[PDB]
């Protein structure tokens with residue numbers, strides 16, 4: 001059983017760019033997110049499920065802003081704070097951070113132990129941020145993820 | 156509760172170098188390994204518990220070889236194959252790979268869902284390899300980790 005999610009680098013001016021997939025599978029310990037990506041900025045990047053099945057940009061403060069259509073971190077249990085993948089009182093969408101290798105590719109899978117069934121993440125989006133993720137809202141909100149670099153809709 | 160493991164970059168010629176710690180804690184989903192490391196080569200590195208509570212080098216083919224005193228991947232259930240952190244018929248010491256950031260530091264924690272109690276990993280060693288970890292013995296043995304870059308003894 002798997003879900004293949006098509007991911008794009010987001011660029012409301014010059015055009016979104018295909019960068020590959022993230023394939024979601026079930027393990028005995030929770031959902032596994034296996035990237036097969038290329039063309040992304042190298043680094044450790046915040047990686048979360050967001051609430052809406054959208055990667056569209058939205059206007060904010062006069063600027064068409066990448067990925068805001070996805071809404072916020074998926075938080076169906078109302079934890080109302082950002083945390084660790086293994087933290088029960090954190091947003092359910094908080095995944096382990098995504099490692100983009102030096103050359104822009106990403107293949108290292110990560111486990112979300114609080115997500116147990118594929119159908120639970122359908123109708124949401126997966127987001128890759130420009131910044132990292134310290135799994136806290138301190139000192140920066142939402143782990144320091146900042147802007148939205150790439151995204152896919154989980155169908 | 157936690158175990159603080161001192162980690163050194165291994166160099167049998169010029170001398171080992173202190174590179175920080177890995178702190179092991181218990182979560183409701185298994186053991187969490189939180190690095191606070193510096194001075195390591197940037198990249199995604201294989202990260203495993205090895206059998207012996209040793210990081211000493213050993214002679215092989217006329218060469219004092221870094222970290223061989225630790226022995227092989229910890230495999231108390233006798234899986235006899237390298238695999239994923241969430242794979243029950245893989246070596247129990249198979250952890251998620253460790254992300255060393257571009258500047259040589261490492262702070263991103265990783266979860267080992269098959270490890271449940273701190274006492275279970277006492278008396279072993281934790282190893283950071285020069286290569287990565289594709290979580291298979293194909294195409295390269297032991298995930299492609301290759302040589303032993305840094306190590307600590309879990310006590």
Ligand SMILES: [Cu+]
Pocket residue numbers: 046047048049050073127128129145
């Ligand atoms: Cu996010």
Ligand SMILES: [Cu+]
Pocket residue numbers: 026116117118
């Ligand atoms: Cu299921």
Ligand SMILES: [Cu+]
Pocket residue numbers: 201202203204205228282283284300
């Ligand atoms: Cu190893």
Ligand SMILES: [Zn+2]
Pocket residue numbers: 048073081082083091093094142
């Ligand atoms: Zn969050």
Ligand SMILES: [Zn+2]
Pocket residue numbers: 203228236237238246248249297
């Ligand atoms: Zn192994």
